[PDB]
Each structure stands twice: as structure tokens, then as C-alpha cells.
Amino acid sequence: ASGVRLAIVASSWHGKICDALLDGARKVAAGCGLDDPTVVRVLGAIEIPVVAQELARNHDAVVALGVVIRGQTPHFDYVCDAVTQGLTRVSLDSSTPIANGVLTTNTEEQALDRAGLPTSAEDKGAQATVAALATALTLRELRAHS
Amino acid sequence: DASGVRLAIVASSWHGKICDALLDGARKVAAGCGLDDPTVVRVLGAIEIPVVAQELARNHDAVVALGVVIRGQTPHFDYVCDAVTQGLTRVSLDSSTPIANGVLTTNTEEQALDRAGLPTSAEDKGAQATVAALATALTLRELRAHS
Amino acid sequence: ASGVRLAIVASSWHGKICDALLDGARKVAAGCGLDDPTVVRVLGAIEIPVVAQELARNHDAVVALGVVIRGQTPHFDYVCDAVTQGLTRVSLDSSTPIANGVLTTNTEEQALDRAGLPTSAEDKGAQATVAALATALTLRELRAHS
Amino acid sequence: DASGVRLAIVASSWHGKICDALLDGARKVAAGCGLDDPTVVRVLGAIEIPVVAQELARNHDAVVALGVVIRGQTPHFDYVCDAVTQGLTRVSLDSSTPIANGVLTTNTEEQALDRAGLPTSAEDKGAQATVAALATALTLRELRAHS
Amino acid sequence: DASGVRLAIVASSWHGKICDALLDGARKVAAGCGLDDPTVVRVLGAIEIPVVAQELARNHDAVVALGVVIRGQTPHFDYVCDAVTQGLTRVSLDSSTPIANGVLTTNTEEQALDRAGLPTSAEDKGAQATVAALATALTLRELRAHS
Numbered sequence: 001a002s003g004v005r006l007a008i009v010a011s012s013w014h015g016k017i018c019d020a021l022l023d024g025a026r027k028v029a030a031g032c033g034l035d036d037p038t039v040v041r042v043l044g045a046i047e048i049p050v051v052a053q054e055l056a057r058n059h060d061a062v063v064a065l066g067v068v069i070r071g072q073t074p075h076f077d078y079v080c081d082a083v084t085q086g087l088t089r090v091s092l093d094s095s096t097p098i099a100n101g102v103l104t105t106n107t108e109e110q111a112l113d114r115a116g117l118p119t120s121a122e123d124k125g126a127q128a129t130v131a132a133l134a135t136a137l138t139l140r141e142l143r144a145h146s
Numbered sequence: 147d148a149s150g151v152r153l154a155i156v157a158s159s160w161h162g163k164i165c166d167a168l169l170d171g172a173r174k175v176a177a178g179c180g181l182d183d184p185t186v187v188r189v190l191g192a193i194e195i196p197v198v199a200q201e202l203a204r205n206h207d208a209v210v211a212l213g214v215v216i217r218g219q220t221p222h223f224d225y226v227c228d229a230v231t232q233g234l235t236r237v238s239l240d241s242s243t244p245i246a247n248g249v250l251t252t253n254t255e256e257q258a259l260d261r262a263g264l265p266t267s268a269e270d271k272g273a274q275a276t277v278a279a280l281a282t283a284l285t286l287r288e289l290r291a292h293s
Numbered sequence: 294a295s296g297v298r299l300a301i302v303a304s305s306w307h308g309k310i311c312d313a314l315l316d317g318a319r320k321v322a323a324g325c326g327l328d329d330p331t332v333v334r335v336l337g338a339i340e341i342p343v344v345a346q347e348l349a350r351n352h353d354a355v356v357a358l359g360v361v362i363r364g365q366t367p368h369f370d371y372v373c374d375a376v377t378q379g380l381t382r383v384s385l386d387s388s389t390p391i392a393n394g395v396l397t398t399n400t401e402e403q404a405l406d407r408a409g410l411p412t413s414a415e416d417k418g419a420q421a422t423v424a425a426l427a428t429a430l431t432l433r434e435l436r437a438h439s
Numbered sequence: 440d441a442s443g444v445r446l447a448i449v450a451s452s453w454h455g456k457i458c459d460a461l462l463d464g465a466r467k468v469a470a471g472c473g474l475d476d477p478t479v480v481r482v483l484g485a486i487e488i489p490v491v492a493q494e495l496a497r498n499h500d501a502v503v504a505l506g507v508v509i510r511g512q513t514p515h516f517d518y519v520c521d522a523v524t525q526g527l528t529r530v531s532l533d534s535s536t537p538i539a540n541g542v543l544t545t546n547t548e549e550q551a552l553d554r555a556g557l558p559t560s561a562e563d564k565g566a567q568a569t570v571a572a573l574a575t576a577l578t579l580r581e582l583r584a585h586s
Numbered sequence: 587d588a589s590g591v592r593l594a595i596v597a598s599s600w601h602g603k604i605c606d607a608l609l610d611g612a613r614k615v616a617a618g619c620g621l622d623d624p625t626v627v628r629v630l631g632a633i634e635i636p637v638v639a640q641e642l643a644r645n646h647d648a649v650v651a652l653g654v655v656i657r658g659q660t661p662h663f664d665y666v667c668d669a670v671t672q673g674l675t676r677v678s679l680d681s682s683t684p685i686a687n688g689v690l691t692t693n694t695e696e697q698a699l700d701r702a703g704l705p706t707s708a709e710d711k712g713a714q715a716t717v718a719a720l721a722t723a724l725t726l727r728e729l730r731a732h733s
């Protein structure tokens with residue numbers, strides 16, 4: 001996976017968790033032979049798909065990272081619905097893997113357990129990057145060459 | 147700073163007070179970021195927002211949507227919100243322009259007041275949405291083509 | 294408001310309420326100077342989007358009126374889902390406001406109370422027309438002239 | 440009259456008895472409206488309906504989709520009905536052709552029988568879906584260009 | 587005899603044993619139908635399927651999608667299923683190609699095992715998806731232009 005162009009875009013709402021998710025992503029890339037990928041920051045999860053649409057015109061793969069926790073209003077449902085619609089529409093418009101590494105949890109302890117911190121049980125940020133990179137290599141084999 | 151961006155705000159009128167509070171907080175962030183007079187447009191309900199926002203998109207770098215939708219005794223709450231979701235998301239990708247979602251979705255009237263930026267409110271979503279739109283407009287400019 | 298082309302498309306399912314909706318829309322059209330709007334009838338709410346798509350080709354605003362009441366099956370949810378997706382896609386393809394005056398209630402007494410009958414609480418049929426006319430008048434001032 | 444309209448019907452196969460009962464009511468209405476032999480095509484499941492409906496819309500004025508989806512023990516039910524709702528809605532507007540939704544969504548099997556047009560049923564949705572398609576086509580015919 | 591049709595299969599890897607069980611059933615239906623060597627591609631997750639299926643569609647008459655999504659402790663379940671539903675439905679209509687939906691969605695692991703087609707399973711949904719893709723392909727072939 002040395003010749004694949006990778007991009008990462010991560011939101012900033014709930015800072016501590018997002019930094020953990022970006023850390024797993026970066027570590028997976030460097031171990032797979034990719035030094036410095038393109039990393040872009042945004043404020044919220046709803047602003048992700050419009051930045052990924054721009055990034056897909058120059059890269060082989062995009063990894064989107066975020067965290068959305070349930071509150072006391074039905075606001076949770078609609079923030080997650082946009083990300084679902086947006087990323088799916090960007091993937092098929094540009095024929096590029098967009099990996100969804102956006103966490104959707106009920107409590108904030110669950111979000112901490114899936115970010116890849118010292119005592120976490122999981123790192124879905126690392127999973128997402130492996131997902132994007134493997135797909136990119138697959139598309140390269142299936143396409144016109146040699 | 148964000149002095150060079152073209153910004154538009156579109157806000158509905160259903161529930162006057164809360165809408166007037168959301169517009170107030172949005173205007174204060176715009177002014178503090180260097181933008182004195184943005185394009186402000188009023189509409190009746192939240193369903194009319196996406197079509198007006200599509201018009202603003204072909205002349206602006208950032209569009210901010212403001213409104214309030216409170217749950218009644220019929221499932222009418224669900225489908226008003228569903229319309230705003232699909233509309234604002236499709237507009238954003240057709241025009242390659244960030245559209246901020248600052249339309250409140252609450253169960254009670256108290257909650258809606260508490261997130262509107264009034265004297266004794268817990269937060270202001272209208273101010274939050276305007277920061278979301280300007281910052282994403284500045285990012286796209288850096289990513290896009292310049293000398 | 295007299296220079297506005299206005300089309301109204303009303304469903305037939307639950308006849309009594311539909312005619313109450315349609316006459317509320319008529320009164321507020323006539324009061325705003327528009328004596329004779331284009332009125333088209335359809336049977337089910339599902340058939341509204343396709344007819345509105347046609348009416349958008351030579352009108353400034355379209356109003357959609359209907360009634361959907363919940364039964365013993367999840368059928369209620371999918372009828373509303375179609376209406377939501379259709380009118381949203383019709384408004385954005387033709388850059389025309391399409392007012393959503395389709396009533397969605399749990400019991401029948403609720404749908405009567407929102408129809409604008411002699412002793413009802415309010416009239417959503419009139420509200421939807423004011424919504425279309427005002428938005429049409431807004432798009433007029435924003436667009437090219439003179 | 441109403442005999443100038445060309446009609447197409449696509450019905451899935453999942454659940455034997457009920458699909459045939461839906462097609463029967465559809466067939467009765469068409470012949471009663473002057474249309475003796477409409478284009479009938481069979482598919483396996485409800486997910487395969489949209490893609491055949493897209494093909495039939497290229498030389499027909501109206502298309503009727505028929506089928507049955509009954510709830511099981513997994514959330515599978517929700518996602519079969521989403522694909523049908525999304526698919527047909529896209530097809531109807533792409534081709535500017537009415538696509539009638541006569542696919543049943545029920546919690547039990549006894550509910551799906553009662554709405555299929557059987558000897559002891561309370562109603563028949565297959566007949567209602569066809570009427571909806573023919574009427575809408577005739578309306579579009581009048582609204583569109585003719586000498 | 588479906589010896590003429592060009593078939594592609596795309597199967598995710600999340601939950602290894604079940605994804606092997608799904609693909610085994612799909613290969614066997616293809617082999618009995620006269621199709622010896624189909625195009626088999628693997629991916630990591632279910633979200634990754636629609637984009638690989640879109641590439642496969644440019645060169646095949648039908649595509650089969652296989653995978654497993656089991657519910658957890660967070661609302662994550664709904665959203666992974668939502669993306670698969672939207673993606674596949676849009677791909678099938680864009681390309682005018684049947685895309686069979688053999689991605690399992692269950693509440694327990696024991697339920698996903700029972701519909702995969704193991705030695706003691708109740709059913710095999712992998713085989714069911716392929717039969718759906720092949721039959722629809724032959725139908726579109728009959729409906730489309732030929733001398």
C-alpha cells in the first residue's frame with residue numbers, strides 16, 4: 001500500500017475523543033508505508049461530506065472521523081442521518097472509498113471505549129483507515145492497467 | 147478572521163421569539179468575524195428553507211439556516227424535520243457550498259428557549275451554526291485553487 | 294401578489310377533510326388578488342409528487358393538500374416517507390417552492406381539527422398557501438430584474 | 440374510454456398466495472377500464488422491483504408495483520421497505536411516469552391476507568393501486584401538450 | 587441454463603466464519619447454473635460494498651452483495667444498515683443492473699448463523715441472493731433488444 005494517496009478529515013466537537021481517533025488513523029498509515037497523508041479538520045459532523053467531496057478529486061481514499069453523543073432532544077437522529085446520506089453520495093459520485101469512522105453512542109464512556117485510548121477496548125479510527133486502504137488497492141487491481 | 151467571505155442567513159418565522167433569538171446570535175458572530183452586513187432572508191416555515199437556500203448558494207460562499215420545530219401531538223414533527231435533513235444535504239453537494247443546519251428540534255418549548263441564546267440560556271445553536279459555516283468556507287478556499 | 298401563477302394539487306383520500314383544506318386555500322388565494330388558481334385533483338398522496346413536477350413547469354408556486362391517518366399497520370410511515378422525499382426533490386429540481394399542506398395525524402378527530410371547519414382550532418390549508426405565495430414573492434425580489 | 444393508456448405491472452414472488460391475489464385485482468381493473476392485455480413481469484423479491492420498473496417506464500404511460508413484506512424477528516423488515524420506498528420514488532420522477540405503490544407492509548400474515556382481495560377480505564390494495572396509476576396517467580395526458 | 591450471464595460477487599470480511607458460509611452457498615448456485623468461474627472480490631466492511639459493486643457493474647450482467655451486520659450496544663447498527671440500503675439501490679438504477687442484497691442484519695450472533703447456510707442452519711441467504719441476481723438478469727435480457 002505504498003503507492004496509494006490517502007486523505008483524512010476529522011471533526012472537532014468533543015476534542016479529546018477526536019484526537020484519539022486521528023491518532024489511530026495516522027499510525028495505521030505510517031505502518032502501511034504512507035508517510036504524511038492529507039489531514040483536514042472541521043468543526044462538526046455535518047460539515048464533513050462537503051470537504052470529502054473536494055478531497056476525492058485528488059486522492060485514492062478518504063477517511064472521515066467524528067463523534068456524536070445522544071443528548072435529551074431528538075437532535076442526535078438528524079446529525080447522524082446527514083453523515084449517512086452525505087458520505088454515501090460522495091463515495092458513488094467520485095468512485096472512491098469513503099470510510100465512515102464517525103462514532104454514534106448513547107453515553108460518553110462508550111465513545112471513549114471505541115477511540116483507542118490507553119484503557120479502551122477498541123479503536124474504530126484504526127479500523128476505518130484499514131477499510132479505506134484495502135478498498136483502494138482492490139479497485140486498482142480491478143481497473144485498467146498493464 | 148473571515149473578512150473575505152460572502153455569507154447568507156435564512157430564518158423561518160414559526161415561533162417569533164426563538165427565531166429572533168437565533169438570528170441575533172448568528173448576526174453577532176458574523177460581525178465579530180469581520181462581516182458587517184450579510185444577506186438575511188425571512189420565510190414562513192422550515193420546509194421553505196431548502197428552496198430559498200438553493201437560490202442563495204449561487205451567489206454566496208456560506209449559507210446558514212435557522213428555525214424551530216417543536217413536537218406536537220401528531221407525528222407531524224418527524225416529517226417536517228426529515229424534509230430539512232434531505233433538503234439541506236442535497237443543496238450542499240449540488241453547489242459544493244457549506245450549508246449550516248441551525249434549525250432546532252425539541253420536545254418541549256423550554257428546551258427550545260434554553261438553546262436559543264437568550265439572557266438565561268444554557269447555549270446558543272444559532273451562533274454555533276454560523277461558526278460552522280464560516281470555518282468550512284475558509285477551509286475549502288485553502289484546499290481549492292490559488293496562485 | 295396578483296402577478297403570481299398559483300397551482301394547487303389536492304388528494305381525494307378522506308374526502309370531507311380534503312374539501313375543507315381546498316376551500317381554505319381558495320379563500321386566501323382570492324383574498325390576495327388571485328381569483329382563479331390551477332386546481333388539480335389526485336386520488337392518493339403518493340401521486341402528488343409526479344403531478345406537482347408537471348405543474349412546476351409553468352407556475353410560480355405549488356400547494357399540495359392531503360390527509361394521511363395512522364392505522365393498525367406500519368403503512369402510515371411509508372406513505373409519509375414517499376411524500377416527504379418527492380416534494381423535496383420536486384422543489385429543488387425546478388427551483389419552485391412546493392408547499393407541504395398534507396396533514397399527518399394519529400386519530401381522525403385531530404385531522405378534522407386542523408382542517409378549518411366551523412369549530413376547528415386552525416386551518417393548515419390556508420397556512421400552506423400563504424407559505425407558497427410569500428416564498429414565490431421572495432424569490433421574485435431576489436432574482437433578475439430590472 | 441380510458442383505453443389509450445399503455446400499462447405495465449410488475450409483481451414479486453415472495454409469498455405465493457397473496458401476490459397472485461394482488462395481481463388478480465390489478466388485472467380486473469385494467470380490463471374494466473378498456474385495457475385487455477397489459478405488460479406483466481414477475482420478479483423474485485421486492486428489492487428487484489425498482490430496476491424492472493425503470494425498464495418498463497421507457498415505453499409505458501403507467502407502472503404498477505405489487506408485493507408483500509411481512510415482519511419477522513430481525514429488523515430486516517425495516518430495510519426491505521426502505522429500498523422499495525426509495526427506489527420507486529426515484530423512478531417516478533426520473534421518467535415523469537406514475538409508479539403505483541401496491542406493496543403491502545404488515546405485522547402479521549392475517550393482516551396481509553385481509554388487504555389482498557381474497558373471497559373474505561376487508562379490502563383490495565391491488566385494485567386501488569391500478570386505479571391510482573390509470574387516473575394519474577389520464578390527468579398528465581390532459582395537462583401536457585395536445586393540439 | 588444461465589451459462590451466458592456474467593456474474594460478480596462481492597463479500598465483506600467482518601465476522602469471518604459467516605462470510606465464508608455466505609460465499610460458499612453463492613458459489614454453489616453459480617456452479618449449478620452453468621457458471622464455473624465468477625468474479626469474486628473481498629472487502630473489509632459492509633459500507634465498502636457499494637463502491638466495489640459500482641466498478642463490477644461496468645463489466646457484468648449481475649452483482650451479488652454478501653455480509654453480516656450484528657447489533658451492538660450503540661445505535662451504530664441502524665447507520666451501517668442505512669448506508670448499505672441507500673448505496674445499493676442507487677447503484678442498481680444508475681447502471682440498470684440487478685444488485686442482490688445478501689447482507690444479513692441480525693440481533694444475535696446465533697440468528698446470523700442460522701441464515702448463513704451452515705450444516706445445521708435453517709436457511710442459506712447467500713444462495714437466495716444469487717438466484718435473485720441471475721433470474722433478474724435473464725429477465726432484463728428477454729425484455730431488452732434482440733434480433
Ligand SMILES: O=c1[nH]c(=O)c2[nH]c(=O)n(C[C@@H](O)[C@H](O)[C@H](O)CO)c2[nH]1
Binds near residue numbers: 098101127632655
Ligand atoms: O460488515 C460490518 N458488520 C458490522 O457488524 C460492523 N460494525 C462495524 O462497525 N462495521 C464497520 C464497517 O461497516 C466499515 O468498515 C466502516 O464503518 C467504514 O469506515 C461493520 N461492518
Ligand SMILES: O=c1[nH]c(=O)c2[nH]c(=O)n(C[C@@H](O)[C@H](O)[C@H](O)CO)c2[nH]1
Binds near residue numbers: 044045047068079247
Ligand atoms: O460532531 C458533532 N457531534 C455532536 O454531538 C453534535 N451536536 C451538534 O449539535 N453538533 C453540531 C453539528 O452537527 C453541526 O456543525 C451543526 O448542526 C451546525 O450545522 C454536533 N457535532
Ligand SMILES: O=c1[nH]c(=O)c2[nH]c(=O)n(C[C@@H](O)[C@H](O)[C@H](O)CO)c2[nH]1
Binds near residue numbers: 338362372539567571
Ligand atoms: O392520501 C392517502 N392517505 C392515506 O391515509 C393512505 N393510505 C393509503 O394506503 N393510501 C394509498 C395512496 O397513498 C396510494 O394511492 C397507494 O400507495 C397506491 O400507489 C393513502 N393515501
Ligand SMILES: O=c1[nH]c(=O)c2[nH]c(=O)n(C[C@@H](O)[C@H](O)[C@H](O)CO)c2[nH]1
Binds near residue numbers: 158160191216391
Ligand atoms: O418552523 C416550523 N416549525 C414547526 O413546528 C411547524 N409545524 C408546521 O406545520 N410548520 C409549517 C411549515 O413546515 C411549512 O410552512 C408548512 O408545512 C407549509 O408547507 C412548521 N414550521
Ligand SMILES: O=c1[nH]c(=O)c2[nH]c(=O)n(C[C@@H](O)[C@H](O)[C@H](O)CO)c2[nH]1
Binds near residue numbers: 483484487509686687
Ligand atoms: O418480497 C419480499 N418480501 C419479504 O418480506 C422479503 N424478505 C426478504 O429477505 N426478501 C428478499 C428480497 O428482498 C431480495 O430478493 C433479496 O434481498 C435479494 O436481493 C423479501 N422479499
Ligand SMILES: [K+]
Binds near residue numbers: 095
Ligand atoms: K479519486
Ligand SMILES: [K+]
Binds near residue numbers: 141142143144145
Ligand atoms: K483489471
Ligand SMILES: [K+]
Binds near residue numbers: 205207241
Ligand atoms: K457558491
Ligand SMILES: [K+]
Binds near residue numbers: 288289290291292
Ligand atoms: K491548493
Ligand SMILES: [K+]
Binds near residue numbers: 349350351353389
Ligand atoms: K416554475
Ligand SMILES: [K+]
Binds near residue numbers: 435
Ligand atoms: K436582484
Ligand SMILES: [K+]
Binds near residue numbers: 496497
Ligand atoms: K413514460
Ligand SMILES: [K+]
Binds near residue numbers: 581582584
Ligand atoms: K395542456
Ligand SMILES: [K+]
Binds near residue numbers: 648
Ligand atoms: K452492466
